[PDB]
Design a protein around this ligand. Structure first.
Ligand SMILES: *CCCCC*
Length: 14
């Protein structure tokens, strides 16, 4: 992926 960002952003919101 384009770094461990998308899943962190998901983790933050939800
Ligand atoms: C996909 C990361 C942002 C979701 C709110």
């Amino acid at each position: 992926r384009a770094g461990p960002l998308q899943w962190l952003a998901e983790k933050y919101q939800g």
